[PDB]
Structures are given as structure tokens and as C-alpha cells.
Amino acid sequence: GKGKPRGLNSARKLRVHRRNNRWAENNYKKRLLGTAFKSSPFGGSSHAKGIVLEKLGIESKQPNSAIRKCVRVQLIKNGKKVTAFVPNDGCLNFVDENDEVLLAGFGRKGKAKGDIPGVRFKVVKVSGVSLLALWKEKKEKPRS
Amino acid sequence: SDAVTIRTRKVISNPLLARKQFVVDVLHPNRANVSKDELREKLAEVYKAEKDAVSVFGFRTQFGGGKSVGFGLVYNSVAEAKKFEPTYRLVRYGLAEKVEKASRQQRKQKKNRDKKIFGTGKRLAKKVARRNAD
Amino acid sequence: ARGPKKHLKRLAAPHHWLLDKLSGCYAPRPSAGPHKLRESLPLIVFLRNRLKYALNGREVKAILMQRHVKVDGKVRTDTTYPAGFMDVITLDATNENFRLVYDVKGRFAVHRITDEEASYKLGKVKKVQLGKKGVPYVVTHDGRTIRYPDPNIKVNDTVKIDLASGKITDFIKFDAGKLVYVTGGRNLGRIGTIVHKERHDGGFDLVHIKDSLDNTFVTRLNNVFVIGEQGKPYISLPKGKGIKLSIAEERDRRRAQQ
Amino acid sequence: PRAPRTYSKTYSTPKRPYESSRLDAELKLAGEFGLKNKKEIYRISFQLSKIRRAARDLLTRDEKDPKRLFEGNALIRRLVRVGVLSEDKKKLDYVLALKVEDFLERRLQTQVYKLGLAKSVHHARVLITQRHIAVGKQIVNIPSFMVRLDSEKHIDFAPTSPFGGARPGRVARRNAARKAEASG
Amino acid sequence: AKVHGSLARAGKVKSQTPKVEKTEKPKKPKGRAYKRLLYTRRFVNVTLVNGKRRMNPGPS
RNA sequence: GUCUCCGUAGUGUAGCGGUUAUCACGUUCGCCUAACACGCGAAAGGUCCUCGGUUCGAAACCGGGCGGAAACACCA
RNA sequence: GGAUAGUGGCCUACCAUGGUUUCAACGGGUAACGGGGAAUAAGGGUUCGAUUCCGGAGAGGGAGCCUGAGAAACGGCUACCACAUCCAAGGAAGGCAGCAGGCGCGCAAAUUACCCAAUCCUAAUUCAGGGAGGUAGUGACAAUAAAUAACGAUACAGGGCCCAUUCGGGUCUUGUAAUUGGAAUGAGUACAAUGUAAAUACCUUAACGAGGAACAAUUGGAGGGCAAGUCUGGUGCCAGCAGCCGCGGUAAUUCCAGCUCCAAUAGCGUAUAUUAAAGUUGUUGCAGUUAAAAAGCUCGUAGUUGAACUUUGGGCCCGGUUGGCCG
Fold it and tell me: Which residues carry this modification: Phosphothreonine (chain E)?
């Protein structure tokens, strides 16, 4: 009988057994338990502004050799200490301490992307101007 | 302006409103449009009426040029035209004059200010003037 | 919500009014009157979109204020008067008398009747009771109250109201072999003959009405309206007489007309 | 609180956007029929999918079915009207055997080329968009018009076009005035 | 384990690289004309075939 | 906006008007392999935030400006 | 029996000890108003649904009440709490989750404009009022169509074929051009007309409006999946690149720039949530000997499932549908 009930009046048993068995799914538990509203640093948001507390530098994981030139930024709403990642080459010069940086996800749905250990977010906009614009010299960072 | 050939369509009769309605089809070859006063002028003699007895609106020029479709009305009498034609079209041609009642904003403020006083205010005006004279 | 509602958005109006969905967000809600709002037709929509006599809302108001139309003998002056089934609008000007009869398709019609036909109106009685002072009365579908009726008149029959005098002149009993008119439902506007009925003493009496083309359908007794005996209609039937041709037959009719 | 207007997407992006075989197929079709965007090919394929889905749903129903018959001839009549299906193929099975090229051939761009007034499909496009070509007595500037075997005889130069007589035109006047003043 | 590694090497190669300016070229047609240019180059005037068609050959 | 506490190599951050140097980390350099690695053998790294004076002579004596680190203010 | 406009523990006095529950009561959480519906897909289904329509709740959190048919009303009052305004300190006046607009909050969301001209509503009533509503402005939330270019002649390079008069012309071609030429409208100007309550736009059309220096189309990538370089210069496990594998330690087809090429196209990339992919939720339609998966074994309820059998067979006919000799 394939290990499942097969009667014309047996629907509660399948419905209940479905309810417990779907809890093994990572997505099902992640959505219904609502851990993104409790433990996620972004709190279920695509972007989050913060204050650049300090400039940070981390080393790569195995088979690699680089300093990723990260940054430690405290989010405004949550007030949590969160590490970010300035993507492009020569982009730490644009950023500085006590600055507003628009954070964003890093593409792994919470996990670390690559050789960067612990960092799971990247800086997209600093001081209201996009990082790409300054790197391509299309816009200039406001002074004050 | 050339070969206007005003052809009327869907003509109807309303003794209820003392008017005849018809979707007026006008062709304007090699010319842009026909002015509203233009169609009203020759609308008079086809219906054997006067210039100040007809009403036309619409005239959305057909894409490409050379054709325009509008809807027209004809009224039997001048007094009937006054009592049935809306005021906005009356002032439009020559039929009346639109007096400016200031605008909506000041009228609302004046209405509220007049609502704040209970009565004509002549006694209130003389009382406040006497008390606040010094 | 804290009282009655006097508004009708242009999305909840009855679909047989054939109103659009772009000219304004509201609909002409009918005022309280002889018929229900979902089973009648306001005078504004009838004169503006059906007869096309009036273009704008004020044109209907000007025509109504000028004492031209006459609904059921009464001139009336309300733009939202709920004229429904068995309503005759008489126009002194244009020499036309209009009668509100449903069509086969499921809407109202512009059927024109002679001046003699407008002098009488058919009415289906709803209640028969002994009122105060012992006077009997009947309650027609339009809500008209006629005192001292024929004792043979019972529930679910039709009377011929004289309109001008408001007196019953003829009554048609409900029995097998009677031409009726379905008012309301997915089978509204059909005209046929009664063969039999299952009583079902729990509500919603059903009657098997059969069309002239041997087509049979079931409609609740609350939606029927006897309009005469077999083969002789007491009212001038609208065009088509409720044949209810299918989508195939309608298409061939169009191709045989163009 | 007015009733909202209805909008719909008329194109379907391919599930496999990255494939050499399909990529060259649409490039050949677009170049042959003179199309700039491949969304035009995406659009015309989307219409083909819809009618094929509708016709497929009809073919799972028995014969002498009022629903199958009425919609079946209505779809067949529309297809033969627009000219994508020949008169001897009105049997509801060739409808599933329609291809994109058959629909593309019915576009006004290809018909202008076929009747011989553009000498090139790209020149048909500029003729379409420059209002030098009309349908019947109406000037049409849309490349996709899908003539329906009845207006094909009415495709001709617009009365308000320099090519078909009328007023000579803009750049011609500037050249004509320049040479007239030079010679005067 | 260190987290305060030297950051003075940031933007190094971004500076030592030479500067080259994009020289002007005849304007490539845009829109339907580009598709026509692709059509006339992909199939009509294919030049290098070798054993399989090549889009952007290098210096051979 | 006004008032107050600090500013010193690359990170650390000393140290003291006739004179700025030290310390670890680091920063490089000879060392080996193949690149390493640890192991190692040596030396490159501050207008004392900016200006102006006091000044024989000042970074430090003083004041102005800025940066940062803390406050109170700021109804056309 | 009170109270209600009414039935009723709605309330009261007395009497009886009942009522619900593993068929999921009760309690807790809800990034929960519900539904019509929206996205997604062969089917099955999953997710979302404050948000234009219907039915509900609220006017800052509660309570109470007048008037009126209808309110437990807050753009109506009364009281308290948390807020907050004007004070010549006695006192008085307020609840934008109405239309605009302001601060704060945040990734995140528009003018302190015009008109009752339309669609309606209300009053004693055709006339008046309505930030209901409509119009305009901001607007790349999403959708539809669609400019940025085409067409001749010259300098080369071709594909069938004619002469077989040598490698001469090549008549018709399709492109490459430090070739050159005519015609063509659109974007933008708009005299004017129409549009509209007045307008602003759309359409119409006088007249003015390209030759590329021009009226300039970007967004990403080129090792693989996943189409597009064993090209040049710079860097040398440094800078950095990569969603996955991985690349860079002086020969980088993966970095940074140039050339070329390709992908979508006024659109493209990125982040988060969701769907198909996923037969990785498996009712259709998973696996359980060893990849994670038979409870040590047995009894056993709720639940699920549960042997066969009881009217057949035979004729007599009639009228409808589908085609059918003969048309």
C-alpha cells in the first residue's frame, strides 16, 4: 500500500501527516517560524542604512590569499553590530568613519558568498551616492 | 475649408427638448480643421435655421487627416436655446458672459468667516469698534 | 452602517442596466418606490442610454421638471424613480407610449404600445388579506393596494389594473395551460406554457414552463408572471416572444441578416 | 474608486534564453521580415501559443459539441479572415500546425514588400513610420497591421504623401528654393 | 588571527595602470539597422569558417 | 549656532619653547624553497591637525581655523 | 419575572448539574479584517491577498450619553489617562488611519493647484452645496505601440551564365569604402484650429525643423554551466574577480584598462520574499537492507480498511440521434 492510507474516507490522516512532514523543509520552517523577523540582522528587509563605526580587514579562507577590506557598520533600526563588504577596487577611500551606508544582501540568502569569512552583506550606497557612480567617476561624494 | 461637404448622420427629433440631435461628419481635405463657427454657419441653412440656434461639440480629428467626427444639436428658438443649452456653451459662442465669482478658495473662506458670526453683524461690528477703539 | 445607505458605485449596479465602467465611479441608485432597486430601471438611465433622448444628467432633470413623462398615469418628477416590470411611461410629446418589458436576452426593452394598450396594466398579486374594518384587499407586484377585490382572486394570479381608475377589471387564474412571463433569474424573459408543478411544501415552489418550440425549463413560482391563457396573450408580447435561440442559431440569424 | 483598466503582457520570454540554435533562428526570421526587437518575435509566438492552447482544448471534445463547434468555427473564421489559413485547411487540425512564419507573412511590412513599393523590408519600415503609406482611406504608421485579404487591394499610397502626388515635400522645397534663388 | 590588517594597499592596481582614452570610431547603427548588420554578417557574409563558425577570431 | 574635553608614524601612539622621538605591532630589505613556511640576518617609516603671532629660539606660551570626540542651542 | 423594537441567562429569583473535548475542545503565537481575486505553472498544487468591489472594525487608548427612523457618532458632546495649543496665570480651545502639506520612522511611497464641466448624493429643491468626484502637476510601481534610419550612383569583392575572340567585357547581383549624390518624415519648435468649465495634453495641419561634430542608447558579460578572445598593455596569492567550480605567488583566454565580439534593448543589473524548476512535500507522484529513514516485541482503542451472495435471462414493439442505396 506504499506505506500511506488509501481509503475514500481517510483524509485527516494524510492532511495531518503532511503538516508534520513539511516542517522538515528548510523554507517551510524559515517562513512560518518567522526567524527573519527575530534573528535576521536586516529584519526581513532588502536594504538597511547604518553608521560606519570603523574600517575592517579580514583574510581569505583556504586556497586563496587576499584582504577583503570589509567594514563594521551598526544598523540604525536594530542597533546591531554588522560587518559589510565594500565590493569594488579602490572603494574604501570613498567611505570613512561616521558615514551613512546603504547595506544590501550578498546573494547567498544569508550565508557567506566566498572566501570572505562571516561577512554576508555588501555596501551599495554611501552618503546618498552610489558606490558604482563614484568608482566610474560619474558622481562625486558630497563633502558635508 | 475646401470641399467641406458637411454630411449629417443619425439625425433624431426631440420635441421633449425642442431640439434635433445628429452626429455631424465633416471632411476637411488638404486643410487642417474646420473652425466651430464655420460648421455652425452652414448648419443654419441646411436645417433652415439661424446661426444662433445650433450647437456642435466634439470634432476629434480622425488620425491621418481629412476627416472629423463630432456631435451637433439644433434648437428651434432663441429662448428655447437659452433655457436648454448649458451655460458653458452659451458664453462660448456669443450667447452670454461668464462673470467671475472670484474662485472656490476665497468663497469657502468667506463662507466660513460668515459662519463664525451669528447674525448680520452690524451690531457686532459697532460693538467691537467701540470696545477696540482705544 | 449606523443607518441606511444612499449611494451606488458603478460596479455593484445590476448588470441588466447595461451601464459602462469608465463614465464615473457611481451609479444612479433608485429611490424607494414600487419596485426593488435590483429589479427596476431608473428614469435617468432609461432616457439617457436607452432612448438617447437626453445626453447629460441635467437634460434628464430638465425634461422631468418640464412635466413630460407620465409613468403609470402619474407624471412623476424623480430622476431615480424605480420603474420596473409592468411600468408604462407615457409621453405627451413625440406621441409615444413606452412599456417596460423584459427581453429574451436578459435586459429591458423599448417596446412601443398603442394608446389603448397603455390604458391597462397587468399586475401579479402577492398577498390577499382581510384588512381593518373587514375589507379585503390584494397586493400586486408593484405594491398597489386595491380594496374589495373579486373573491375568486387568490395568491399567485394576475389582475388587469385599469391604471386610470386603479380598479381591477379582469383576473387570470393560475392553472395548467396559461401563458406566463418569467421575471427574474437566469431564465428571465422566457415566455411559455405551464404543464405541471411540484408543490414542495417547504418553500420555493417550482413550475415547469414549456416553450412553444417544445423547450422546457424550471423556474421558481416567485419569478413567474401569468400574462394570459394558452395562445392568447393579454399583453402585446415583445419582438421574438422569448424563443431563446442558442448561440449557433443566433450566429446564423446574423449571417442571414448582414 | 473608478473601475481599473485592464492590462496584459503580450510577449513571453523564452525559458532557455541562452541557446545558439534558437538564437540564430530568430535572427534569421527578424532579418528576413525586417524586425528590430526580438520581442516582436516573442509577441507573435505568444499569440501562436494562445490560439494553439485554445484550439487544443477544443480538440479534446467530441464532435457535434455546441461549445466546440461555435468557438471552433469562430476561431477558424478569424484565421481564414486574417489570411494565415487557406480555405481548404479549415478543419481545426491545421490550426495546431501553424508556424510563426505564416503569421509574420501577414504583417503589413511584408505585404508592402510583396506588392512592390519598398524594394527592401527596411525601406518598408521607414515608409511605414514616415506616413507615406495608407490602408484604404486611412494613414497607418504601425508596421504590424495584419491585413485580412480584404484590405490587401486597398493598400496604396496615401493622398497626403509626396510620393503619391500631393504637395512636393520638405527637403525638396529647401533644395528647390535654394536652386531657384541661386538661378534668380 | 588578525582583524586589523594593513589597508594601505587598497586601490593599488587602480593607480599603477596606464591611462588609455577611447578613440572615436564610425557610429555603429542602432536598432533595426544593427539587426540587419548582424544578419548581413552572421549568414550572408560569413568569412571565417575553419571547421565550425567563429564569431570573434583573434590574430592567427 | 554657543560652550566645553582631546588631536601626536602605517596600525599603536609615546615624549618633551632654545632640539620629533621611542615602543610593540606592522613596513620593507639580505635569508632559504619552487612558491613557501617557521627558522631567521638587517633597516625604511612624523608642517607634532591648519594659520597667525609671542618669538634668539615654539608643536608644546597664547589666540584664530579645521578635524574628530562630547554637550547645550537653532519657531521665515 | 424584569429589560429589549423583538426570540434568547440579555439580566434577575429559585431549582436540577449540566455543556465542550484526540472527529484537535481549551490555551498561546500570528511580519492574521475576511471574501470576490492576484502571481506561478501540462494536470495536481503552492504562495499572496492592507490596497479601487462586497461584508466588517476604528477616529489617540477606554467608558457614558443627548438629538434623530437610524450613532453608542468623535470634521456631536461628558469624564479619566497618555499627548498637545493660546495665556494681560483667572481661564479657554483640540483630536489629519478626510483633501493637500509638516516633523519623526524607515530600504520604501506625490502639488499646502483648478473645477462641480462631467458620474452621482443631499436640502424646502431643475438654479445651491459636496478635497464624494473629475481635471492638471510630480511620477521609469506595473502594461500597449513605437524614433535613433532608409534608398540610388562610383572604388573593390562576388553567384548563376553569355561569348570559349587570350586573365577582356561582364551585362542582373550582395557587401566592403580616408567615395559622392539626390529624395523622406519623425523627436523638437505651434501661426492656427480642435481639445477642454478655463485650460495643459492627444489628433489635425500653415511655416521653421539631420549628412554624422551630427537630433550621439545604454545595461552586463566574454574559462565552464551560460553566447561572447589563447588579443594587446598594466598588476604579480598583492590589488582584486567569482551566485557554483575556481583565477591571481613575473608567460592571467577569469583581475584592472584598450580593441573586438555577443546577450536584452529604453531598457538592463543587483538585493530580499515567492512560484515553476522540485518526482527536494510526492493525493496524483518520494524513500526506509547498506546514501537520513521499520518503534526491541506483543496486546489494543479512536481512526482506516473490511469474503461471497438477494432480478437474471428471454422476447414483443414504438418513437428520437448519427451517418446511409436513391441525391
Answer: 47
* Lookup: nucleotide whose C1' is closest to E8 CA: F10
Burial class (CB in 10 A: 0-12, 13-18, 19+), C219: buried
Q: Hunting for cell 516582436 — which residue is that?
A: D40
Backbone torsion region of residue D166, taken as left when φ is above 0, otherwise alpha when ψ lies between -120 and 50, otherwise beta: left
DSSP character string of chain B:
--S---EEEEEEEETTTTEEEEEEEE--TTSS---HHHHHHHHHHHTT--GGGEEEEEEEEPTTSS-EEEEEEEES-HHHHHHHS-HHHHHHHTS--------HHHHHHHHHHHHTSSS-SHHHHHHHHHHT--
Task: For residue C88, count other CB atoms closer than 10 A to its CB.
Answer: 21
Nearest to A98 by CA among A54, A67, A141, A129: A54
Grid coordinates representing B97 are 458672459
Residues 3-32 (D) with a CB less than 8 A from some CB of C? 3
Q: How many angstroms separate the CA atoms of B54 and B38, rounded? A: 12
The DSSP bridge partners found for residue A129 are: A126
Establish if B65 touches chain D: CB-CB under 8 angstroms.
yes
Q: Are D148 and D167 in contact (CB under 8 A)?
A: no
How far is the alpha carbon of D76 from chain E, nearest alpha carbon, in Å? Answer: 34
CA distance D73 to D94: 13
Count of alpha carbons within 13 angstroms of residue B23, beta-carbon side? 7
Sequence ranges of the domains in chain B: 1-134
Nearest-Cα residue of chain E relative to residue A58: E3
User: Quick check: C143 and C82 in contact, CB under 8 A?
Assistant: no
* Beta bridge pairs of residue C97: C90, C113
Q: How far apart are CA B119 and CA A14, in angstroms?
A: 79
Q: Which of residues 22-51 of A touch strand G (CB under 7 A)?
A: 22, 24-25, 27, 30-31, 33-34, 36-38, 44-49
**Yes or no, beta carbons of E32 and D24 under 8 Å apart:** no
Separation in Å: G121 C1' and D70 CA: 45
Per DSSP, the three-state class of C134 is helix
C-alpha span between A97 and A73 (Å, rounded): 9
Task: State whether the beta carbon of A63 lies below 7 angstroms from any atom of strand G.
Answer: yes
User: Which residues are CB-neighbours of D79 under 8 A, at least 6 positions away?
Assistant: D51, D85, D95, D98
The DSSP secondary structure of D111-151, one letter per residue, reads HHHHHTSSSSHHHHHHHHHTT-EEETTEE---S-----SSS
**C53 touches B: beta carbon within 8 Å:** yes
* Chain E residues with beta carbon closer than 8 angstroms to that of A91: 10-11
Contact present, C173 and C188 (Cβ < 8 Å): no
Quick one: A46 exposed, middle or buried, by C-beta within 10 A (0-12, 13-18, 19+)?
exposed
| Resolution for this PDB entry, in angstroms | 3.2
Grid cell, residue C179, equals 401563458
* Rounded-to-integer distance, Cα D30 and Cα C66, Å: 66
Buried b (16+ CB within 10 A) or exposed e, C137-154: bbbbbbebebeebeeebe
What are the backbone angles phi and psi of residue B102, rounded to the nearest 5°?
Answer: 55, -130
Q: How far apart are CA A125 and CA A101, in angstroms?
A: 6
- Per domain, the residue ranges of chain A are 1-144
Between residues 36 and 55 of chain E, which touch chain D (CB distance below 8 Å)?
36, 38-40, 42-43
Q: Count of CB atoms within 10 A of residue C181's CB?
A: 28
Cell (9 digits) for B123: 451690531
Provide, for chain C, the percentages of residues in helix, strand and coil under a 3-state DSSP scheme, each rounded to the nearest 5: 15, 30, 55
